[PDB]
Amino acid sequence: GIFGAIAGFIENGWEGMVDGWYGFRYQNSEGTGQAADLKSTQAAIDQINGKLNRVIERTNEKFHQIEKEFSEVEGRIQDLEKYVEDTKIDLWSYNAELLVALENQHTIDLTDAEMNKLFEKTRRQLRENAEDMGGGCFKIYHKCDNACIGSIRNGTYDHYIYRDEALNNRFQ
Amino acid sequence: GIFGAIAGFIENGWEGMVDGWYGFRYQNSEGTGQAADLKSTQAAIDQINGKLNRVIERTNEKFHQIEKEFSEVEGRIQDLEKYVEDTKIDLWSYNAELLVALENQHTIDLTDAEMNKLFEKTRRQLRENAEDMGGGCFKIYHKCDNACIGSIRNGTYDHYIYRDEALNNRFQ
Amino acid sequence: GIFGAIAGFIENGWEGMVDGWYGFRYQNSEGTGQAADLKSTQAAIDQINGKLNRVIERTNEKFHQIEKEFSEVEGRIQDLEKYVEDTKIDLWSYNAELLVALENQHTIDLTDAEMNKLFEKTRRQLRENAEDMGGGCFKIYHKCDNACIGSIRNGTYDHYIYRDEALNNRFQI
Amino acid sequence: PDQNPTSGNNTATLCLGHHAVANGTLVKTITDDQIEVTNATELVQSISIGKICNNSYRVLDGRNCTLIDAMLGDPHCDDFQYENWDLFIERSSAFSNCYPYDIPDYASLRSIVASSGTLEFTAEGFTWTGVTQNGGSGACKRGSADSFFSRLNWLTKSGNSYPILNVTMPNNKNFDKLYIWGIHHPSSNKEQTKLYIQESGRVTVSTERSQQTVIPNIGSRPWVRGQSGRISIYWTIVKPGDILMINSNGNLVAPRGYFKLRTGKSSVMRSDALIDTCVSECITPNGSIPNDKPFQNVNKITYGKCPKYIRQNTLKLATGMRNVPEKQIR
Amino acid sequence: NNTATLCLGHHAVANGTLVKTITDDQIEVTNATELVQSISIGKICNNSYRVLDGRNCTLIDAMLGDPHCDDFQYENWDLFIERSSAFSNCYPYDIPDYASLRSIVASSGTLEFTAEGFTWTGVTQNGGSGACKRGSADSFFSRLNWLTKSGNSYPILNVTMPNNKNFDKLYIWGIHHPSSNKEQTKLYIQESGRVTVSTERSQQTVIPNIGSRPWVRGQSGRISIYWTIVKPGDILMINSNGNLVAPRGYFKLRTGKSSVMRSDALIDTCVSECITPNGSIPNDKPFQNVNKITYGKCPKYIRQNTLKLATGMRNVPE
Amino acid sequence: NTATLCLGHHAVANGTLVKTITDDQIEVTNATELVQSISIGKICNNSYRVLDGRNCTLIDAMLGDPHCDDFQYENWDLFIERSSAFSNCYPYDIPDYASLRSIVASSGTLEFTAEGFTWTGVTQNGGSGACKRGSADSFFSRLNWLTKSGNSYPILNVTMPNNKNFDKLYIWGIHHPSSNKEQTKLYIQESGRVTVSTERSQQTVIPNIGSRPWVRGQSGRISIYWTIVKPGDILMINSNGNLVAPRGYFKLRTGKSSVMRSDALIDTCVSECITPNGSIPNDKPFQNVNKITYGKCPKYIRQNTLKLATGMRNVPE
């Protein structure tokens, strides 16, 4: 991955996160929890669906063409009929091998990129009240119960409320 | 895009910014103001013009070929003559549909990257004298007049001069 | 560079680094030093070698085909035999032109990425004990000898050991 | 203090992450030949339904008959007389059962007829003065009587004269007429004179634009249903306003009329698959196939709305992120 | 107040334009540029290339020497233009492998002709016909020599012509098929004619084909045109005993960059390096959707009529 | 009591320029060429079985031109035809010459089996001064030139059933004399004819009396034809004059063999690709040497050079 988050600074995925592609796990005063993030998940799915719309259920109608198998030998004009079909197939085969390879490199990148977007988004919320521990975890420098964690997940965490307390716990 | 800045953590573009592609808006002791950044703007344009050079005015010269319309019904070698031309058209039609798709995807990503490159460039200049409010805005924790802003735009802002002041505003 | 590290906020490369693509240069109580980061170097090389193995020798095996040069003029079917080989060649010429152009853009972007990965990795270890000077250099605010620098390079640097000493130096004057 | 599931009362840990599955699936990329992702979807169609679906395109089973033997009117192909099709299916076990023949440039006629998609025939009352009509053979039995191709008229001498036959037929319809005619090559000079009087036959079908001339070719051939003689089929096309003319002093196998040429999207396919009531907009010799995927490895020969044939039997497109499992050891 | 705020951002426009991407079907960007040429000028530009109007004539009738196609005696072209309203107004004919002869001449790009003193002893030459009226007299295709009997009989002709040059000579000849046997003997004496045109590496025999055809201008008979190519150092030979429509001389074959194109559009003065039947088109874009048939420096034909390449960022107004 | 850690990347003295989607020229630390544009100079004979036609073309070797007798039961992967090849037997022509050349080239073998065609009432083994084998008049070896015996030439009626598991290739011909004297001298009948037929197909050919230009002292000609015969079918031949008879069949194969025109030298080396210019290596995906090829070959393209970056952007001080 190009951003180095998935299979990077995040050691591994969570197999117990069945209701999302991206999300949080927390440990606070009320216990340890888990929770998916629907926005980021949907961002990744939608792009992936975007690619599927271009490739799936997309075919040309074709009718009469040229013969591609032969009973007798006929030299020149059959050599030509064969070469044409052989040339066409090799060219379409290349196009397919390349389409997939490209899209896949890009799928892995845009997912890795969405994981990084969530981390940056959350970093901005928490502001001076937490620090990057590495591994994808923040250490929040104030008591933050389940409601408080929800406010971060909801996108409604006002950092000014805990700022003074937090600065004190970081430096003293 | 993939850096999540344009159509991302920056909420929207400025229609008022007509003298550049990326830039700054700022308020201070002297009031509000706007100013474009030529370096970042020009980095993006060069890359887009770079693509235009590969696409525009690149044209193969051709002369006598094969007949592609037929008055009479002939069969075997007419069947081929058409199928050949039909194969060619489909493959070029695919090459064209894909080219545009990839180039456009890429264009969005590189323009988004230049936006982000400028943000990270500014963040580094300020160092400990500012915080990331979100929306791609910085709170500079000291009196920063027009001349001061100019140095941030010019890349000549010395962070040590205001350090003791801003740093004192940030924690107390 | 899509991250703007190589040929961006990092001003230039180091000709003096000859046993690695990425790495460190440092100044401390014991002198100055340089070491290559094996891990990031290998990440890029592995990725670049993947591409090589995709393109390089994956050739088909063709045998008897159609003729492509001619002595006598003939008309219709010779016109066709020529048009077909010409059509084929032009398409494969497009494929090779694009192939190279896409790969190289990607090769540049992925090398640029490993650089920025290494920086961010390092920044996260240092935590509150250093600041970003710009130019890809950190300013570590404690006595960080060659062993300390070595722990940063190993990814076993324990910031709590120096936190007090460091926080103390950053917020002063 | 060790199993405490809470944090130390004035801090908390907020970890960001992504999902992962116990059984991932490998895909190809620009930099990796095999790389595990959470999920992927096959882009190459390599399974066939097993039979040809005949509710999308009109599929005509030719059974024991080829498209040509249907057209000419070989007796055991009489069923196909007046019939149209989107796809005509030719079987491998098919055979001919009339007088032995050859069609110089067989393939072209076969294609021309196939694309048109119809054997609709219109009889024209040609005047053939001075000759015996409706010749037949034991090599082409209709019942227990000698007979012939239902769309051809074998002409022989009447009494002591094979006159120079001179007949025209102006195309006044607003479409192109297709005419099937031929010539007889007897197995000896005794026969050539016995049937046509003249020592040396000739047939000349002509328009205002084009012409074709054929001479018979005397000499024995291998037995086919008891007959050393042979016939050769040729074809002519007449356009609206143009006129047909047929001149011959011997060996003519005259036409009984014309076939009506349409510009059509129809075709012909060599297949031994069963035809059946199912749903599919793409047909191949192996059977019909679905067209949800963009590519296919079933057969290069196809009719209809089909995925494009490639050499690869599989190409996986990733529909999920890189898979990075939790448990190194299960 | 002793603090300031410094916001970063990007530009936008009232209404942008929609493009395709790998992940979106439609998506707004600030600007784009069209890569498919959809529309032509209307005329065929006769400036960059030497366009030659056929008007009433085909290339084949021009070669053979139809009385009304005399204009094109020694003319050349990069692109020959054939109108739908053309016709033949000479003796009725056909050509086996017509398209191929038409292709070979168009490619050579020239009707440069050099006559040769063939010796046709024992036969009356320069036969004509009312169906091919030139000016006001029974004439014939200018490049072909119709040979007939000389009173008493028609001898076995046996004529040679060696290729001394170092380029390919193109020869055009034919054979006459009468409407009756009484005619076949009236002009060619013998019961059945024959034409055997041979080189030292090749040969072609055509037998005439007596019998009436449909009425074209007043004639029941026909002529079938054949052709032969003699290489450097090689030698031509013609051996006929009846029905020979002999050649007068040879055409020069140049390996060229020329062609022929069917069209009914106006040929006129303008700038362009690409030519179609619909007219000339500008070749600034990489692709085109006008007409698959083209000549010159041309955008490649595709089936799409529009493709916008993004030349700006994502557009996000306020 | 402070330190400085700097992160960086390497650079080289002399990088190398490459194309990208954005830049026509941009310098990187290294690259690798994808267009093979230089050839070894000569054709390598170790990888594939290369066969030098020398003074013979493929067709002359089949027919059995006396100076081509060395190529009798030969086989090849690739058969090399030299610009200096010449025909030296009786003058001939072959309608659709290219097709027969292709068919034999593909089969990759001149394995000929002779059969006991019974020709009665005719003298066999006609020859010519135009086709000398040693100092004596001779003919194409695989062909049999029949003439009248005694004072007549019968209507020949011969069969030969293909009771084999493969397609049989039969090469036959017709003779065209230079006059009616010569037509009636050799064959008696004033008008010759050759009919070769299967149960499926047939071919009739009339000869054409008339003088052609001298080739090795002869103004006559033969036109060569062929008939392929399938398992279970039966070849019949009926002629009252001018027949240039077959002596047997060539065993056809579906094979991976071909024929190439080249004047390149053929020497000991190794390479899995062959062109008219010489053999080329196949480590690169593309080539610009020649569009004519045989073997495991890079694909031919217009461009003579295409550099794939194998390293990062090169940024020196």
Ligand SMILES: *[C@@H]1O[C@H](CO[C@H]2O[C@@H](C)[C@@H](O)[C@@H](O)[C@@H]2O)[C@@H](O[C@@H]2O[C@H](CO)[C@@H](O[C@@H]3O[C@H](CO[C@H]4O[C@H](CO)[C@@H](O)[C@H](O)[C@@H]4O)[C@@H](O)[C@H](O[C@H]4O[C@H](CO)[C@@H](O)[C@H](O)[C@@H]4O)[C@@H]3O)[C@H](O)[C@H]2NC(C)=O)[C@H](O)[C@H]1NC(C)=O
């Ligand atoms: C990834 O792996 C998942 C995990 O599944 C497995 O667990 C691992 C540890 C191993 O033990 C594996 O052997 C095992 O597969 C996959 O999920 C499973 O997917 C399979 C098919 O791939 C499902 O098979 C179905 O089982 C149905 C019944 O399920 C219950 O009982 C079975 C034992 O019989 C157990 O496996 C389950 O755990 C359940 O307890 C069954 O109803 C289905 O067949 C039906 O249809 C037929 C008609 O053909 C009919 O005759 C029959 O009566 C049935 O009604 C079928 O056999 C399996 O259930 C599912 N299991 C779970 C727990 O999810 C997953 O497929 C895989 N992903 C990919 C992409 O491969």
Ligand SMILES: CC(=O)N[C@@H]1[C@@H](OC2O[C@@H](C)[C@@H](O)[C@@H](O)[C@@H]2O)[C@H](O[C@@H]2O[C@H](CO)[C@H](O)[C@H](O[C@]3(C(=O)O)C[C@H](O)[C@@H](NC(C)=O)[C@H]([C@H](O)[C@H](O)CO)O3)[C@H]2O)[C@@H](COS(=O)(=O)O)O[C@H]1O
């Ligand atoms: C009422 C009637 O039958 N009158 C006789 C004429 O017959 C015919 O009239 C012409 C207009 C034509 O349409 C015929 O189809 C019609 O029957 C006859 O006129 C001629 O008849 C012959 C018969 O084939 C030719 O058609 C002949 O054609 C010419 C020509 O093109 O003008 C004469 C020309 O010199 C000749 N060129 C040669 C020998 O090099 C050609 C050539 O023979 C044919 O094109 C070969 O296919 O034809 C036409 O004149 C007249 C004249 O007869 S005469 O013997 O020529 O004097 O006689 C009436 O009784």
Ligand SMILES: CC(=O)N[C@@H]1[C@@H](O[C@@H]2O[C@@H](C)[C@@H](O)[C@@H](O)[C@@H]2O)[C@H](O[C@@H]2O[C@H](CO)[C@H](O)[C@H](O[C@]3(C(=O)O)C[C@H](O)[C@@H](NC(C)=O)[C@H]([C@H](O)[C@H](O)CO)O3)[C@H]2O)[C@@H](COS(=O)(=O)O)O[C@H]1O
């Ligand atoms: C000046 C003169 O009249 N001299 C004749 C001489 O005529 C000629 O010389 C030969 C070399 C040739 O170039 C002729 O074009 C030239 O006018 C007689 O020589 C024979 O001529 C006949 C033609 O009538 C043949 O060319 C024949 O050549 C062969 C040959 O070598 O190919 C002899 C073969 O035995 C024969 N093979 C057969 C029948 O199977 C072939 C074959 O008949 C021919 O290729 C078919 O197209 O021809 C020359 O031998 C010379 C002897 O004439 S003879 O008595 O009829 O044999 O008499 C001189 O006075």
Ligand SMILES: CC(=O)N[C@@H]1[C@@H](O[C@H]2O[C@@H](C)[C@@H](O)[C@@H](O)[C@@H]2O)[C@H](O[C@@H]2O[C@H](CO)[C@H](O)[C@H](O[C@]3(C(=O)O)C[C@H](O)[C@@H](NC(C)=O)[C@H]([C@H](O)[C@H](O)CO)O3)[C@H]2O)[C@@H](COS(=O)(=O)O)O[C@H]1O
């Ligand atoms: C042992 C012996 O000599 N028996 C002969 C018959 O010889 C033959 O047997 C027949 C069945 C064929 O296999 C012949 O090839 C074989 O020689 C001979 O039978 C007649 O032979 C004729 C050939 O010369 C015909 O084949 C004839 O049958 C037809 C046919 O059914 O196809 C009869 C048709 O009416 C006729 N159609 C026409 C004229 O329009 C055709 C036609 O002639 C040929 O297809 C043209 O190529 O032939 C068959 O009965 C007889 C001779 O009888 S006959 O009076 O000459 O007719 O004599 C036995 O003793």
Ligand SMILES: *[C@@H]1O[C@H](CO)[C@@H](O[C@@H]2O[C@H](CO)[C@@H](O[C@@H]3O[C@H](CO[C@H]4O[C@H](CO)[C@@H](O)[C@H](O)[C@@H]4O)[C@@H](O)[C@H](O)[C@@H]3O)[C@H](O)[C@H]2NC(C)=O)[C@H](O)[C@H]1NC(C)=O
């Ligand atoms: C020139 O030669 C030709 C072939 O060498 C001659 O043709 C042959 O003519 C005879 C007599 O007319 C035919 O005899 C008939 O053969 C058929 C074939 O049946 C075969 O298969 C069945 C299978 O059960 C078997 O029972 C038979 O024994 C045969 O093997 C018989 O059905 C008839 O009763 C009859 O006897 C030959 O068939 C035929 N041979 C070939 C190969 O075509 C021809 O007569 C000669 N022509 C001239 C002008 O001289």
Ligand SMILES: *[C@@H]1O[C@H](CO)[C@@H](O[C@@H]2O[C@H](CO)[C@@H](O[C@@H]3O[C@H](CO)[C@@H](O)[C@H](O)[C@@H]3O)[C@H](O)[C@H]2NC(C)=O)[C@H](O)[C@H]1NC(C)=O
């Ligand atoms: C019809 O005309 C042709 C064309 O002229 C005649 O062919 C020529 O025949 C003569 C001998 O009869 C050849 O002469 C020979 O030339 C060679 C040259 O190397 C020389 O070595 C001999 O001594 C002899 O003089 C001449 O080459 C040949 N024409 C060619 C090759 O173009 C033919 O005789 C005529 N036939 C009839 C039936 O009228």
Ligand SMILES: *[C@@H]1O[C@H](CO[C@H]2O[C@@H](C)[C@@H](O)[C@@H](O)[C@@H]2O)[C@@H](O[C@@H]2O[C@H](CO)[C@@H](O)[C@H](O)[C@H]2NC(C)=O)[C@H](O)[C@H]1NC(C)=O
């Ligand atoms: C990561 O590095 C630390 C730091 O110490 C050093 O780094 C080495 C790569 C090398 O440059 C060395 O000269 C330098 O001292 C390692 O700690 C050291 O471990 C060794 C045993 O391997 C001990 O002998 C040292 O006392 C110890 N020093 C300190 C200051 O801790 C560490 O082992 C290494 N870890 C890994 C996983 O490689």
Ligand SMILES: *[C@@H]1O[C@H](CO)[C@@H](O[C@@H]2O[C@H](CO)[C@@H](O)[C@H](O)[C@H]2NC(C)=O)[C@H](O)[C@H]1NC(C)=O
């Ligand atoms: C937006 O794109 C348009 C074209 O889509 C550009 O306008 C063209 O500019 C160049 C000048 O070199 C020329 O091709 C034409 O004169 C212009 N008009 C066309 C092609 O229609 C231009 O780059 C952009 N214009 C904006 C942003 O206002």
Ligand SMILES: *[C@@H]1O[C@H](CO)[C@@H](O[C@@H]2O[C@H](CO)[C@@H](O)[C@H](O)[C@H]2NC(C)=O)[C@H](O)[C@H]1NC(C)=O
């Ligand atoms: C055979 O018949 C054709 C037509 O069926 C005759 O051609 C016609 O000839 C007359 C003049 O006598 C013309 O007015 C007509 O235009 C001709 N018709 C066509 C269709 O060409 C022809 O004369 C006859 N020929 C023979 C040899 O009998």
Ligand SMILES: *[C@H]1O[C@H](CO)[C@@H](O[C@@H]2O[C@H](CO)[C@@H](O)[C@H](O)[C@H]2NC(C)=O)[C@H](O)[C@H]1NC(C)=O
């Ligand atoms: C991912 O792979 C595919 C989609 O990319 C999913 O398979 C399909 O799921 C839906 C059913 O809700 C339908 O489109 C098809 O019935 C499924 N495919 C079949 C039957 O081949 C699949 O569910 C996804 N896998 C995971 C692990 O999420």
Ligand SMILES: *[C@@H]1O[C@H](CO[C@H]2O[C@@H](C)[C@@H](O)[C@@H](O)[C@@H]2O)[C@@H](O)[C@H](O)[C@H]1NC(C)=O
């Ligand atoms: C956001 O959260 C506020 C309180 O915390 C909550 O946690 C959430 C995850 C939710 O499920 C509930 O337990 C609580 O609401 C709440 O006051 C705000 O209303 C929430 N706002 C929005 C927009 O969701």
Ligand SMILES: *[C@@H]1O[C@H](CO)[C@@H](O)[C@H](O)[C@H]1NC(C)=O
């Ligand atoms: C940038 O602006 C500052 C203050 O406005 C000024 O002092 C300086 O000269 C400028 N630098 C450059 C390089 O333009």
Ligand SMILES: *[C@@H]1O[C@H](CO)[C@@H](O)[C@H](O)[C@H]1NC(C)=O
């Ligand atoms: C928990 O926090 C309280 C202050 O709220 C403090 O007095 C106490 O010592 C803390 N204990 C631990 C183990 O953090």
Ligand SMILES: *[C@@H]1O[C@H](CO)[C@@H](O)[C@H](O)[C@H]1NC(C)=O
């Ligand atoms: C192009 O053709 C037209 C046809 O009328 C003519 O007027 C004009 O002079 C021609 N232009 C040139 C440059 O030959």
Ligand SMILES: *[C@@H]1O[C@H](CO)[C@@H](O)[C@H](O)[C@H]1NC(C)=O
């Ligand atoms: C760089 O690539 C070239 C050409 O492919 C090769 O010869 C050279 O050894 C490589 N150099 C390095 C340092 O990898």
Ligand SMILES: *[C@@H]1O[C@H](CO)[C@@H](O)[C@H](O)[C@H]1NC(C)=O
């Ligand atoms: C190889 O041979 C062809 C054929 O003549 C020649 O034109 C071409 O330039 C040659 N290519 C080389 C030497 O790479």
